Design a protein around this ligand. Structure first.
Ligand SMILES: O=c1ccn([C@@H]2O[C@H](COP(=O)(O)OP(=O)(O)O)[C@@H](O)[C@H]2O)c(=O)[nH]1
Ligand SMILES: CO[C@@H]1O[C@H](CO)[C@@H](O[C@@H]2O[C@H](CO)[C@H](O)[C@H](O)[C@H]2O)[C@H](O)[C@H]1O
Ligand SMILES: [Cl-]
Ligand SMILES: [Hg+2]
Ligand SMILES: [Hg+2]
Ligand SMILES: [Hg+2]
Ligand SMILES: [Hg+2]
Ligand SMILES: [Hg+2]
Ligand SMILES: [Mn+2]
Length: 263
């Protein structure tokens, strides 16, 4: 049961005026491709707040990667799901090394030293790399049952150029005539149920490869791509959500650089 939205005043959408004329904003299976200009964040914030949505953000920080936590968490506080309930889950081998970052109200952080817990604590799970920083808004526009993010190095490439696992002996195998996009393993998510299904499928597939004495060319990312090929994501995030300005600059097609690699 979803409550009704309140009266809102905003620009009327124009049926005969395309959102963006420079990029694809919807996939062939009718999943929105999230680019700046395609969404009214006020409407989306209302929809998700009315459901008291809680987003879990998971990050792994092992060995020297614990050094990336301060900037990651501090910038997430400024740009990630602001206004909504957020639960950070930091998986680390050095609990005492996690920085003391000040959090806004309605936001919490749990340290797990290295789950049915996720199902009862959050509505959506967002899984990202820790050696990153938020530079702009990353909000509820990304929430959906299952989403993948376009790899910044292949968004304009042909499927034949995609670095999928090409060996038939691997469970992550994808032939040259298949593939929608090349998703980067550094940023994916969805409902807890869908994320756990994906993680479970990949874990089992990797065990099979290991038993067959083979390791996918790009490990977890290769399996993620195989999964998303066979289970189409309900939303795809544009490269605005996974960029590297030092290596790729700032092209016009990107109106905002939201989540980037740390040099
Ligand atoms: O020694 C390591 C190596 C990797 N990671 C985690 O694994 C992620 C992905 O691997 P990495 O970032 O090192 O390579 P990349 O994703 O940039 O190709 C890192 O962001 C961390 O979240 C970690 O915690 N400790
Ligand atoms: C310009 O060539 C591209 O350079 C990128 C940055 O080194 C490479 O990024 C890697 O891409 C891999 C998959 O092909 C993995 O995603 C890996 O984690 C990335 O660092 C890119 O491969 C290469 O084509
Ligand atoms: Cl992750
Ligand atoms: Hg638009
Ligand atoms: Hg996760
Ligand atoms: Hg994760
Ligand atoms: Hg998989
Ligand atoms: Hg995966
Ligand atoms: Mn990384």
């Amino acid at each position: 049961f979803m409550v009704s939205l309140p009266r809102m005043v905003y620009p009327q959408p124009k049926v005969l005026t395309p959102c963006r004329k420079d990029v694809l904003v919807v996939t062939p299976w009718l999943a929105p491709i999230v680019w700046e200009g395609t969404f009214n964040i006020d409407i989306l914030n209302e929809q998700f707040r009315l459901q008291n949505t809680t987003i879990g953000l998971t990050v792994f920080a092992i060995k020297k990667y614990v050094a990336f936590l301060k900037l990651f968490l501090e910038t997430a506080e400024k740009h990630f799901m602001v206004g909504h309930r957020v639960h950070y889950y930091v998986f680390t081998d050095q609990p005492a090394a996690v920085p003391r970052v000040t959090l806004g109200t309605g936001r919490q952080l749990s340290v797990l030293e290295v789950e049915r817990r996720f199902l009862s604590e959050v509505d959506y799970l967002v899984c990202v790399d820790v050696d990153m920083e938020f530079r702009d808004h990353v909000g509820v526009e990304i929430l959906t049952p299952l989403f993948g993010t376009l790899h910044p190095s292949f968004y304009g490439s042909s499927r034949e150029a995609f670095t999928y696992e090409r060996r038939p002996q691997s469970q992550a195998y994808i032939p040259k005539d298949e593939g929608d996009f090349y998703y980067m393993g550094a940023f994916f998510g969805g409902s807890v149920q869908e994320v756990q299904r994906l993680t479970r499928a990949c874990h089992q597939a990797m065990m099979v490869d290991q038993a067959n004495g083979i390791e996918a060319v790009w490990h977890d990312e290769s399996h993620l791509n195989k999964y998303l090929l066979r289970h189409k994501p309900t939303k795809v995030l544009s490269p605005e959500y996974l960029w590297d300005q030092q290596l790729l600059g700032w092209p016009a097609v990107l109106r905002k650089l939201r989540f980037t690699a740390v040099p």
